Amino acid sequence: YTRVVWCAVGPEEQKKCQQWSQQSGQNVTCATASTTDDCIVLVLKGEADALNLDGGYIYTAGKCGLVPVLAENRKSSKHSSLDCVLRPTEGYLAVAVVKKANEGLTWNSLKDKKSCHTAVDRTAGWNIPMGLIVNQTGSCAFDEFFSQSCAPGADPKSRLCALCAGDDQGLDKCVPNSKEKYYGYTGAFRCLAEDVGDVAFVKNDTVWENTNGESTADWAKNLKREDFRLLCLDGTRKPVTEAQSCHLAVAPNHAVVSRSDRAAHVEQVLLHQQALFGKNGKNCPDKFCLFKSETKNLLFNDNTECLAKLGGRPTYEEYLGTEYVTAIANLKKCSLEACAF
Ligand SMILES: *[C@@H]1O[C@H](CO)[C@@H](O[C@@H]2O[C@H](CO)[C@@H](O[C@H]3O[C@H](CO)[C@@H](O[C@@H]4O[C@H](CO)[C@@H](O[C@@H]5O[C@H](CO)[C@@H](O[C@H]6O[C@H](CO)[C@@H](O)[C@H](O)[C@@H]6O)[C@H](O)[C@@H]5O)[C@H](O)[C@@H]4O)[C@H](O)[C@@H]3O)[C@H](O)[C@H]2NC(C)=O)[C@H](O)[C@H]1NC(C)=O
Ligand SMILES: *[C@@H]1O[C@H](CO)[C@@H](O[C@H]2O[C@H](CO)[C@@H](O[C@H]3O[C@H](CO[C@@H]4O[C@H](CO)[C@@H](O)[C@H](O)[C@@H]4O)[C@@H](O[C@@H]4O[C@H](CO)[C@@H](O)[C@H](O)[C@@H]4O)[C@H](O)[C@@H]3O)[C@H](O)[C@H]2NC(C)=O)[C@H](O)[C@H]1NC(C)=O
Ligand SMILES: *[C@@H]1O[C@H](CO)[C@@H](O[C@@H]2O[C@H](CO)[C@@H](O)[C@H](O)[C@H]2NC(C)=O)[C@H](O)[C@H]1NC(C)=O
Numbered sequence: 001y002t003r004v005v006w007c008a009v010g011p012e013e014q015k016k017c018q019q020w021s022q023q024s025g026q027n028v029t030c031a032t033a034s035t036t037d038d039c040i041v042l043v044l045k046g047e048a049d050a051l052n053l054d055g056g057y058i059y060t061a062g063k064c065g066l067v068p069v070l071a072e073n074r075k076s077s078k079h080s081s082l083d084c085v086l087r088p089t090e091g092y093l094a095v096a097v098v099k100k101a102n103e104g105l106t107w108n109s110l111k112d113k114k115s116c117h118t119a120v121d122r123t124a125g126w127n128i129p130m131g132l133i134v135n136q137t138g139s140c141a142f143d144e145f146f147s148q149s150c151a152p153g154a155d156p157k158s159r160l161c162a163l164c165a166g167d168d169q170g171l172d173k174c175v176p177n178s179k180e181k182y183y184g185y186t187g188a189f190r191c192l193a194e195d196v197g198d199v200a201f202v203k204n205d206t207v208w209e210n211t212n213g214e215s216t217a218d219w220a221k222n223l224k225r226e227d228f229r230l231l232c233l234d235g236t237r238k239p240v241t242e243a244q245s246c247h248l249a250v251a252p253n254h255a256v257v258s259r260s261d262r263a264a265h266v267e268q269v270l271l272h273q274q275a276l277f278g279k280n281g282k283n284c285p286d287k288f289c290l291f292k293s294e295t296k297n298l299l300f301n302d303n304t305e306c307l308a309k310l311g312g313r314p315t316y317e318e319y320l321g322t323e324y325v326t327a328i329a330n331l332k333k334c335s336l337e338a339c340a341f
């Protein structure tokens, strides 16, 4: 009847998927690939059914005909009466973060500094801040704005990979998967925290989830929120408490996508799966938790309360919203219809 194949990106996701697999009695199973881009291709081929993606990849996948099915939903303050699965999604704040101790650094003095990005093509780590930088500079030359960076998915021998560290052994430098030490929200933030870089483009939640004891990770257990500052677009710096007033943009939530002809089936199984291994699930911290991976954000972001139904039966353009879609288009003109494969 119903069996779903999930696409895991890199070996750590693979491992988490295998566990979910064994726990679901094989109701879910796993395919693995090296990059999100490849995973998308497996789905198009029909060798994989689904994966959860950042909005920048939702855009890629969309041109290829894939569709959003369920969105990530994190703890809400407003919109409280509704059960999470039917609660509207809020979106996340894309911020630029720096060290307080690095005085005098503002949005207007980023040129020639060192940067930490979650990965090329992602929303908070790339699309927003690079689009803004392309716009106010007039130049499509974004590889030349920062002196060095860690930008996973960029050419390993270019300046945009210069700060990436690879794995344990120094292998896989700048691969866009968790093998790369400075990959994703948590890796970019760690890139700033270790003073490898001057600024990190991550979301508001990351700063909080890795400071003041929220993470027992050794590179973080000792970090304090007051030690960081957010760069606002008007040239000022604020405490990380002012995010709602000092952000680069509001990002659409990460969401699960699948081929359109598989959407109904994918939706059904996952709804059941969260009942079982979700935030309050039947089995959930006893045997297995779909939304926990030790601050690593494997398959899903760790702050996910549930996957929510969409309503309005959104196309991918509707889901990301016209504002966001026009920034990608304009940025994409730098390096308008097709499917990237
Ligand atoms: C940037 O990202 C970071 C990291 O993710 C965000 O920080 C997180 O934000 C969330 C929610 O926004 C935090 O909420 C969590 O914390 C609580 C405990 O840890 C949890 O329980 C809360 O209990 C309450 C129950 O509804 C909620 O608020 C309460 O509601 C009343 C008013 O809001 C009020 O009760 C009475 O007293 C008032 C007196 O002033 C009266 O006026 C009222 O009328 C009423 O009688 C209480 O004051 C009370 O606060 C609350 O929302 C929670 O439900 C909760 O489960 C949740 O998990 C989360 O902890 C936090 N993480 C960290 C590390 O801080 C940050 O918000 C982001 N910021 C932006 C701007 O985007
Ligand atoms: C980098 O720089 C590029 C190039 O300028 C910039 O490009 C874009 O800039 C803006 C940002 O979206 C965009 O403006 C559009 O404005 C109107 C209005 O869109 C509506 O907004 C209101 C309120 O939300 C509402 O009417 C609708 O709900 C829409 O959301 C848009 O369409 C108009 O629609 C109304 C009716 O709805 C109509 O009366 C008008 O005649 C008009 O059709 C415009 O067409 C614009 O699309 C720019 O258009 C867009 N510019 C280009 C060249 O594409 C990027 O955003 C910048 N990149 C980054 C990351 O910042
Ligand atoms: C594997 O998937 C099936 C399909 O939902 C689950 O078994 C179903 O259980 C529900 C609730 O009792 C029934 O309504 C269905 O008719 C059952 N289907 C069949 C054919 O067995 C089962 O719970 C799933 N297992 C796990 C661990 O996820």
Ligand SMILES: [Fe+3]
Binding pocket: 054, 055, 122, 123, 124, 251, 254
């Ligand atoms: Fe994202």
Ligand SMILES: [Zn+2]
Binding pocket: 001, 002, 003, 265
């Ligand atoms: Zn089936």
Ligand SMILES: [Zn+2]
Binding pocket: 247, 249, 250
């Ligand atoms: Zn805003």
Ligand SMILES: [Zn+2]
Binding pocket: 312, 313, 314, 315, 318
């Ligand atoms: Zn519609």
